[PDB]
A and B are shown apart, each in its own frame.
Chain A
Amino acid sequence: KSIRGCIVGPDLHALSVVLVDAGDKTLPGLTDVVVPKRLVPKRASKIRRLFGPKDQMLVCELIKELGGEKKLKYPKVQRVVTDEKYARKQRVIAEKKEIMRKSLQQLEEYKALLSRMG
């Protein structure tokens, strides 16, 4: 697709400029506005940043999924260890040992089967 070059030239329509330093000056745009970002942290580390299981430690709004009845709105926490989750991983680790244990047992038996025959 035809694209345009990084060098700026006399012809132009739109230029987008981030501000490294405004300077002591006061500008109606950018010094009279402070942005309240809509979204809020939804992860374990991010929940442990703004507010320092910590699921209840979240601010609450009242908005539905699609937009008098109002649902208290909590963005779902992610990466937080549930007590069943911790338990779920715990039994898979035990299961992995069981697979090794059964194979370890089957191995001695098979070495023995050849040995008993000769």
Chain B
Amino acid sequence: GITHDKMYKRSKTGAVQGKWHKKRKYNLGRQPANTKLIVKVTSKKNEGQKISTIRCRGGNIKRRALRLSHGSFAWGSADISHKARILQVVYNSTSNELVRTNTLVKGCVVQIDSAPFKSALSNDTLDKEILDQIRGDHILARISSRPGQVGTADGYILEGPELLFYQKKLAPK
């Protein structure tokens, strides 16, 4: 019964708009997916990453992710891409309450294990700052994929002014 029609909403003036129809299955919206992480592998290993699949109007299926673990992350200015497990979620624009639960949302800044990206550090002088993150086992990456709309969490390693901005916000914690 969750619906995205504007029949139940007011006008520009703020006038009540009379309802002329009952709910439509063409206007329905499904409940939101909380894409948690398998962060605590100790007691979360008992549930492998699970991606559900929901039928949609047209019969086309949208895979929706319930629990995720790893996604393709790419260092663009180095052309180094590897599948990396997501260690932790930090700093979301929508709410920092989400960050506590680790629920993944497109645009959340995550931390990924640098062990897959180890070869790039040995390759000489790739960028500068990102190399230090590879030397320490945590690299910041933004999830660029919508978990729950494709059931995947791929992303990009943060670089440039964006990396600095995110780090500055996360400096005290």
A–B direct contact (CB < 8 Å): no
